[PDB]
Amino acid sequence: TDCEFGYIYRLAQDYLQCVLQIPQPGSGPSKTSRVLQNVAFSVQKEVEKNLKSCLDNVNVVSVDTARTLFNQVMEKEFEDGIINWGRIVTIFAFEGILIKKLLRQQIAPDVDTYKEISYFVAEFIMNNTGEWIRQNGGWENGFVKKFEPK
């Protein structure tokens, strides 16, 4: 009921809906999601401006380019074998950056794309950090405890 693909997919999907400013009822986002949307967006804003020039030099023209780019970037970022909550937060930030570029550059505009982004984001998080996340208290006893308002 946490640490599972479904839960992580819902987190990744919530963050994209927030970035894109589309409403998703279902009785509202979890406390975890609310805390994450806040801190991830804070990182996205800073990373966007610092990485501005570099990003102008890539055209995210499709979901496949987004996936490949995401995988290549995430692989280099985590190649040192280190994992922590700060780093996991940046995965969402970069997810947000990607969807924005895709909204502006996607050749065949698809209104479900953010569902497929959320998918491979959760896929990467699952396969590469799932065990670490578990051993560190999961989302509600790890991430939330660390990042919630004091």
Binding site: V39, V43, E46, V47, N50, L51, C54, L55, N57, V58, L69, Q72, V73, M74, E75, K76, E77, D80, I82, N84, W85, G86, R87, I88, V89, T90, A93, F94, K146, F147
Partner: peptide, 25 residues
């Protein structure tokens, strides 16, 4: 490429800065 490296390296540094920054046990 240097763009995926430039991206990954910057995300990593931000990630680590945000991490040690948060709680400070």
């Amino acid at each position: 490429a240097e763009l995926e490296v430039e991206c990954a390296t910057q995300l990593r540094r931000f990630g680590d800065k945000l991490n040690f920054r948060q709680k400070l046990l």
